[PDB]
Amino acid sequence: MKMLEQLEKKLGYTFKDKSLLEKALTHVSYSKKEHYETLEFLGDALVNFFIVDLLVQYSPNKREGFLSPLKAYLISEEFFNLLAQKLELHKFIRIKRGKINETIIGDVFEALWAAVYIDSGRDANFTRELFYKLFKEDILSAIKEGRVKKDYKTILQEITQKRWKERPEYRLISVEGPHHKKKFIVEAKIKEYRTLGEGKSKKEAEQRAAEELIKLLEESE
Amino acid sequence: MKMLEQLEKKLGYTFKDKSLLEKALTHVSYSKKEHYETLEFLGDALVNFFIVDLLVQYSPNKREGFLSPLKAYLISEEFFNLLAQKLELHKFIRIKRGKINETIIGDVFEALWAAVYIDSGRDANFTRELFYKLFKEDILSAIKEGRVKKDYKTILQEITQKRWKERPEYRLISVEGPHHKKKFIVEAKIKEYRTLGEGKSKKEAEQRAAEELIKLLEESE
RNA sequence: CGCGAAUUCGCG
RNA sequence: CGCGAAUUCGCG
RNA sequence: CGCGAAUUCGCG
RNA sequence: CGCGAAUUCGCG
């Protein structure tokens, strides 16, 4: 296909089986029999490994407390899209009109790499170098500027300020258990949408509620 | 023969560098800045990959709905402990005798393969085979035989009947999500104790709840 | 112990 | 319905 | 679990 | 209509 060649040209790899490359680009809404779903599964574990290995090598601090935040960002939907954009993935994806979104691009990106892996005769070392060739420069850049992930409270506040010029209100509902290992439950509220959050401290609880309240706000669109 | 050599043989690999192999086997509580924390962080990613590649290649059903639960069981410390028996890590692991539990063994399991990976000049392929060499059948064995999920409810019932002669009471708290994928949340209670659980079905939720209820039904009387 | 039932939970 | 478990009741 | 059905939502 | 998710009722 005139299109597959281009995508291959960008990756610097030619598939020994065009049906495999095509499968990774095909969404379930295009072909109920052969879609990226399964490769997506394998790519998740694959890309995860590539990124985690780059992290433990180029991170100024090796402790888990430090590395965890960075990983959360590196394997996030957001970042995967940035990297998928260097290939213009949306252009080559085969899906039904109006069903595409950022969650999808992120997955085909994962599947895409599971494809190369398998098509290269499951050669891990090879796939990894190809991946770094195209993205190592970008990954080390994120690690260096400490790019983390915004917590739910900050995200919620922005969402609710973008739409209503208002901020949610958290309130303490109840307290329970023992004094040493206390249980908190807070209520996140915006307009008339409400969610509850449970946790060890008032803050963590709020973080939970905010996360919930964000899900709720999504569907109300 | 030395401790290491004894393991290197049961592992089928002779470390170029001994320090690395002995680091993966150490617990901070013994070696202040020479424990497996970091290696474990990479090993996790490395092993999750080794498994996922094997799972999506030989699994009967290659649907994400089917594989997802299988994975959870395959990379669980619970399972890693079973695989670990092949080596009896609970014999070479260096630690202040009196804290070595199940989790630690798992972390060491992951941390070990990370050591192999590095000492092998970071040859994922090589390390992967060495892995299948030892655990391929075991994994395949568990992949197709099926997971005999733990019946927390009945167990929980066998306890409250033993200590209070009264069986537990479950209670639905909420139901969220689209009707094609509802997400339940139930609250299990006994006498004056409470715990929550959530799942794709009431039964599932009831289990996740009767579970946490047991973990806490041992932190009192 | 065996036989027959009940209640509850689980699996099929 | 069947199997299993727990706790009961009856019979042998 | 198997048989017979209802309801809601998703997918062909 | 057929698949699939969830919730139920009758029978075995």
Side-chain angles (χ1 to χ4, degrees), chain A residues 35 37-38 40 42 45-46 48-49 52-53 56-57 62-64 117 122-125 128 198, chain B residues 37-38 41-42 45-46 48-49 52-53 56-57 62-64 67 71 117 122-125 128 196:
Chain A
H35 55 291
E37 171 168 337
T38 297
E40 184 289 311
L42 177 52
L46 188 76
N48 177 59
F49 167 58
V52 172
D53 185 56
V56 296
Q57 289 186 60
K62 310 303 180 179
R63 300 196 187 71
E64 178 263 306
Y117 173 65
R122 285 196 169 71
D123 181 316
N125 305 307
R128 191 190 64 221
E198 309 176 6
Chain B
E37 198 185 76
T38 306
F41 182 101
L42 176 64
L46 184 56
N48 166 64
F49 161 47
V52 169
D53 186 42
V56 83
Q57 181 172 183
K62 301 193 186 304
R63 299 298 301 180
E64 180 184 303
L67 309 177
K71 181 183 169 182
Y117 174 65
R122 278 198 154 69
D123 186 316
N125 289 130
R128 184 189 59 196
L196 291 186

Side-chain angles (χ1 to χ4, degrees), chain A residues 161-172:
Chain A
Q161 274 186 161
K162 169 67 175 181
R163 302 187 191 179
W164 302 299
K165 274 63 134 83
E166 299 186 305
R167 294 177 303 99
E169 291 183 49
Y170 306 81
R171 88 177 188 187
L172 186 51

Side-chain angles (χ1 to χ4, degrees), chain B residues 151 153-154 157 203:
Chain B
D151 188 317
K153 294 189 67 184
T154 307
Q157 161 162 308
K203 266 188 181 300

